[PDB]
Amino acid sequence: SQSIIAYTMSLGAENSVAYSNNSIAIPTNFTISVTTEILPV
Amino acid sequence: ANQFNSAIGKIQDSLFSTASALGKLQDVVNHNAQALNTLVKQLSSKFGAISSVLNDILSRLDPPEAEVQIDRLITGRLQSLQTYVTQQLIRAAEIRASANLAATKMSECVLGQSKRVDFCGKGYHLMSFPQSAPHGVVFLHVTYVPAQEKNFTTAPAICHDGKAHFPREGVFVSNGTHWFLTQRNFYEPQIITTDNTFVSGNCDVVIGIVNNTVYDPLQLELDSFKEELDKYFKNHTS
Amino acid sequence: SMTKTSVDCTMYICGDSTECSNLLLQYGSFCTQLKRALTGIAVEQDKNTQEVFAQVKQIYKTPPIKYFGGFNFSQILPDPSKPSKRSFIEDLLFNKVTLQKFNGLTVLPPLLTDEMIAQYTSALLAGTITSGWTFGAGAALQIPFAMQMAYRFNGIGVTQNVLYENQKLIANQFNSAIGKIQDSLFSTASALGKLQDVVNHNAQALNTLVKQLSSKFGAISSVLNDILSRLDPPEAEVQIDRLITGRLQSLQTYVTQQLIRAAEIRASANLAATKMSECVLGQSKRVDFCGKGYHLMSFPQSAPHGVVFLHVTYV
Amino acid sequence: TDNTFVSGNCDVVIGIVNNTVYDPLQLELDSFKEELDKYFKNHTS
Numbered sequence: 300s301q302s303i304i305a306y307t308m309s310l311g312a313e314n315s316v317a318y319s320n321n322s323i324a325i326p327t328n329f330t331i332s333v334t335t336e337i338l339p340v
Numbered sequence: 341a342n343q344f345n346s347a348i349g350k351i352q353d354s355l356f357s358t359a360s361a362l363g364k365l366q367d368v369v370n371h372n373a374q375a376l377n378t379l380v381k382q383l384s385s386k387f388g389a390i391s392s393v394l395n396d397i398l399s400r401l402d403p404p405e406a407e408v409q410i411d412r413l414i415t416g417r418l419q420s421l422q423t424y425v426t427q428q429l430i431r432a433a434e435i436r437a438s439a440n441l442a443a444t445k446m447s448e449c450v451l452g453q454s455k456r457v458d459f460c461g462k463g464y465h466l467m468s469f470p471q472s473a474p475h476g477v478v479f480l481h482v483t484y485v486p487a488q489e490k491n492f493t494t495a496p497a498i499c500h501d502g503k504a505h506f507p508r509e510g511v512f513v514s515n516g517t518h519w520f521l522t523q524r525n526f527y528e529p530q531i532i533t534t535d536n537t538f539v540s541g542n543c544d545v546v547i548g549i550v551n552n553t554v555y556d557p558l559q560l561e562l563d564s565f566k567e568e569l570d571k572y573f574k575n576h577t578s
Numbered sequence: 579s580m581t582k583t584s585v586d587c588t589m590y591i592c593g594d595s596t597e598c599s600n601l602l603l604q605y606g607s608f609c610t611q612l613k614r615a616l617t618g619i620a621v622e623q624d625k626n627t628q629e630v631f632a633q634v635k636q637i638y639k640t641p642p643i644k645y646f647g648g649f650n651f652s653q654i655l656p657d658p659s660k661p662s663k664r665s666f667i668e669d670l671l672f673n674k675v676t677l678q679k680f681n682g683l684t685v686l687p688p689l690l691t692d693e694m695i696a697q698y699t700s701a702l703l704a705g706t707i708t709s710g711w712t713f714g715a716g717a718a719l720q721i722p723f724a725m726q727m728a729y730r731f732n733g734i735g736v737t738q739n740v741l742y743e744n745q746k747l748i749a750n751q752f753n754s755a756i757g758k759i760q761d762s763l764f765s766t767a768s769a770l771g772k773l774q775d776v777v778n779h780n781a782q783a784l785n786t787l788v789k790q791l792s793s794k795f796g797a798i799s800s801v802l803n804d805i806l807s808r809l810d811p812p813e814a815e816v817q818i819d820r821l822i823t824g825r826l827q828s829l830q831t832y833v834t835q836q837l838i839r840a841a842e843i844r845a846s847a848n849l850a851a852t853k854m855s856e857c858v859l860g861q862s863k864r865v866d867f868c869g870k871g872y873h874l875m876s877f878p879q880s881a882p883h884g885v886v887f888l889h890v891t892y893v
Numbered sequence: 894t895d896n897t898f899v900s901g902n903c904d905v906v907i908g909i910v911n912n913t914v915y916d917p918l919q920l921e922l923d924s925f926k927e928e929l930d931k932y933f934k935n936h937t938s
C-alpha cells in the first residue's frame with residue numbers, strides 16, 4: 300500500500316569524530332574514484 | 341590500474357541510468373525551446389485588437405481605422421520581443437559564467453594537477469579527462485581517496501638525548517609499544533632515525549613530547565668499526 | 579541567497595474584477611513567463627544555499643571535552659542551551675541582521691530552516707577542528723589540534739617546530755583575535771552591510787511593486803471599481819486597459835530586476851561555496867583568497883541570507 | 894653540507910661570498926684519524 304509521506308529533512312548520518320588527545324587515524328589503503336562534472340558551455 | 345578500470349567502467353552506468361547529473365544541459369535546451377515557443381505563441385494574442393492577423397485587420401478596415409488595431413498588435417508584439425531578448429541576455433550571462441568556469445576547469449584540472457580542494461572532484465586530485473556533450477563539457481575527475489584508516493597513538497616530537505626531534509616529513513605513530521615515522525596519507529611505518537628527523541631545542545618546551553630512542557646509522561657503523569679496531573688492538577697487545 | 583517571492587498576476591493587476599481579467603486574458607502568456615521566472619529564482623535560491631552549506635557527508639560532532647591544545651572555540655561552537663543550537667557569533671549575527679502580502683505578493687520559506695543551516699555549520703566546524711582537511715577529502719581522520727596546526731604551519735612554509743615551541747603564545751594570540759571578532763563585526767561597520775542590503779533591497783522592491791497599484795497611468799482612477807461605476811463599458815475599456823498596461827509594466831520591471839539581482843546573488847553564492855571548499859575544507863595557497871596573510875584555517879558561521887568566514891592567517 | 898647542495902665552481906654566481914661550510918662527517922673522521930695516529934705513535938714509541 301504505497302502512499303505519499305511527508306518527513307523532515309535528514310542532513311546525513313550522525314558521526315562523532317573520535318578526537319582523542321594523542322591519537323591519530325592514518326589510512327592504510329586507498330581508492331581511485333572517478334567522479335563526473337557536467338557544465339553547460 | 342584495476343581500480344581505475346573498474347571506476348571508468350562504472351562511469352557509463354552512473355551517468356544516464358541514475359539521473360542526478362546531465363540535467364543541466366537538458367535544462368539549457370528546454371529553457372531555450374520554451375522561450376522560443378512562448379515567443380511564437382504570442383503571435384496569436386489580440387492585445388486588444390479585433391483580430392490577431394494583420395491581413396484580417398487590413399482586409400476589413402479602412403486605413404485610418406486599421407491604424408489603431410495594427411498599432412495595438414505592434415505594441416504587443418514589440419513588448420513580447422523585448423521580453424524575449426532581455427531574458428536571453430540574462431541567460432547568456434549565466435551560460436557565459438558557466439563557460440568561463442568550464443574553461444578554468446579545463447585549464448587547471450585537465451592541463452595540470454590542481455591543489456584547490458573540491459575544484460576537480462571529491463578527494464585529492466589525480467587528473468581529469470574531458471568529453472563533449474551537446475552544448476557542454478563533461479569532466480571525468482580521477483581522485484585519490486583514503487580507504488582503510490587505523491588509529492595509532494601519536495606524539496608531536498621525540499626526546500632521545502635531551503634534544504627534541506621533529507619529523508622531516510610525516511608523523512610519529514605508535515601501535516602500542518614501538519614508535520615509527522609514517523607519511524601523512526598512507527601507513528608506511530619507518531624506523532625513526534636521524535635522517536628523517538631534525539633537532540630543535542631540548543625536550544622541556546614541547547607539550548606532549550614522548551620518550552624514544554632515535555637510531556643514528558653513522559654512529560652505528562662507527563661503533564662497529566671502532567669495536568673491531570679495539571679488538572684488533574687488544575689482540576695485538578696481548 | 580535572497581528572499582524567494584511569488585506573484586499572482588490576476589490578483590495583483592485585476593484583483594477580483596471579472597471584466598478586468600477578461601481583458602487581461604487578451605495579453606496571452608505574458609504572465610506565465612513571470613510565474614516561471616519567479617519559480618526559477620526560488621529554486622535557484624534553494625540550490626545556492628544547499629551548494630554553499632551542504633559540503634559534509636555526515637554531521638560531525640566534537641567530543642564532550644572541548645580542549646584543543648589551548649585554542650578556545652567557545653564563541654563559534656554550538657550552544658546547547660538554546661532552541662536553535664547556534665553559536666554566540668551566529669546568535670549575534672542573527673539578531674543584528676533583521677529588517678505587501680495584501681495584493682497577490684507572497685513570500686515562500688527557504689527549504690533549509692535556520693536550524694538546519696546551523697547544524698551544517700556545526701558539522702563543518704567540528705570536522706575542521708577534529709580532523710583537519712581530511713574530512714573534506716574522504717573519511718574523517720582525527721588528529722590533535724596542535725599537530726594539525728603544525729601541519730598548517732608546514733603548509734605556509736614555516737617549520738612545524740615553530741608552532742610547538744610557541745604553542746602557548748599562538749593559542750593566546752588566537753584567543754585574543756577570536757575575542758575581538760564579536761566587537762569588530764558590528765561596531766566597525768564596513769562588512770555585514772551586504773546581507774542587510776539584500777534584505778532592504780527585497781523590501782524596497784516589494785513595496786514599490788505594491789505601491790504601483792495607486793498610480794493612474796493616465797486612467798480616471800487607480801481603482802477598478804471606481805472606473806466600473808463611473809463610465810459605460812465601451813468607454814471604461816480604455817481606462818481599464820491603461821491600468822492593465824501600467825500594472826503589467828510594473829510587474830515586468832519587478833521580475834526583470836529580480837532576475838538580475840538573482841544572477842548577482844548566484845555569483846556571490848558560487849564564490850561562497852568555493853571559499854567553503856577551499857578555505858574551510860582545506861588550506862589555500864591562493865593569495866588574498868582566504869584573508870590577508872598566509873592562510874592557516876577558516877571557520878564558517880551562518881548569517882541571515884549569507885555566510886561569514888572567520889579566516890585565521892599568519893602575518 | 895646537510896642543508897646545502899653544491900653546483901659548480903664559484904666563477905659563475907654573481908655575489909657568491911666566502912665561508913666555511915661545516916662537514917660533520919669530515920670532522921668525525923678527522924677526529925678519529927687523529928686519535929688513531931696518536932695511538933699508533935704511542936705504540937711505536
Ligand SMILES: *[C@@H]1O[C@H](CO[C@@H]2O[C@@H](C)[C@@H](O)[C@@H](O)[C@@H]2O)[C@@H](O[C@@H]2O[C@H](CO)[C@@H](O)[C@H](O)[C@H]2NC(C)=O)[C@H](O)[C@H]1NC(C)=O
Pocket residue numbers: 550551
Ligand atoms: C622522559 O625521559 C626523561 C629522561 O630520562 C633519562 O634518560 C633515559 C634514557 C633513562 O636513562 C632515564 O632513567 C633518565 O632519567 C625523563 O626525565 C627524568 O625524569 C625523572 C623523573 O622525574 C628524573 O628523576 C630524572 O632526573 C629525569 N632525567 C633527566 C635526564 O632529565 C622524563 O621523566 C621522561 N618522561 C616520561 C613522560 O617518561
Ligand SMILES: *[C@@H]1O[C@H](CO)[C@@H](O[C@@H]2O[C@H](CO)[C@@H](O)[C@H](O)[C@H]2NC(C)=O)[C@H](O)[C@H]1NC(C)=O
Pocket residue numbers: 327328329342343
Ligand atoms: C586495499 O584494498 C584493495 C581493494 O579492495 C584490496 O584488494 C582486494 O583484496 C581482496 C582480498 O584479497 C580481493 O578479493 C580483491 O579482489 C582485491 N581487489 C583488487 C581490486 O585487487 C587490497 O587487498 C587492500 N590492501 C590491503 C593492504 O589491505
Ligand SMILES: *[C@@H]1O[C@H](CO)[C@@H](O[C@@H]2O[C@H](CO)[C@@H](O)[C@H](O)[C@H]2NC(C)=O)[C@H](O)[C@H]1NC(C)=O
Pocket residue numbers: 515516517518
Ligand atoms: C608493533 O609493531 C612492531 C613492529 O612490527 C611489533 O614488533 C614485532 O613483533 C613481531 C612479533 O613478535 C616480531 O617478529 C618483530 O620482530 C617485532 N618487530 C620489532 C621491530 O620489534 C609489535 O609487536 C607491534 N605491537 C603490537 C601491540 O601489535
Ligand SMILES: *[C@@H]1O[C@H](CO)[C@@H](O[C@@H]2O[C@H](CO)[C@@H](O)[C@H](O)[C@H]2NC(C)=O)[C@H](O)[C@H]1NC(C)=O
Pocket residue numbers: 320547548643645646
Ligand atoms: C590532554 O593532555 C593535556 C596535557 O598535554 C591535558 O591538559 C591538562 O591535563 C591535566 C591532567 O593531566 C588537567 O588537570 C588540566 O586541566 C589540563 N589542562 C587544561 C588547560 O584543561 C588535557 O587535559 C589532556 N586531555 C584532554 C581530554 O584534552
Ligand SMILES: *[C@@H]1O[C@H](CO)[C@@H](O[C@@H]2O[C@H](CO)[C@@H](O)[C@H](O)[C@H]2NC(C)=O)[C@H](O)[C@H]1NC(C)=O
Pocket residue numbers: 650651652653
Ligand atoms: C573561551 O572564551 C569564552 C568567552 O568567549 C570564555 O568564557 C568566559 O569565561 C570567563 C571565566 O569563567 C567568564 O567570566 C566569562 O563570563 C565567560 N564568557 C562567556 C561569554 O561565557 C571561556 O572561558 C574561554 N575558554 C577558555 C578555556 O579560556
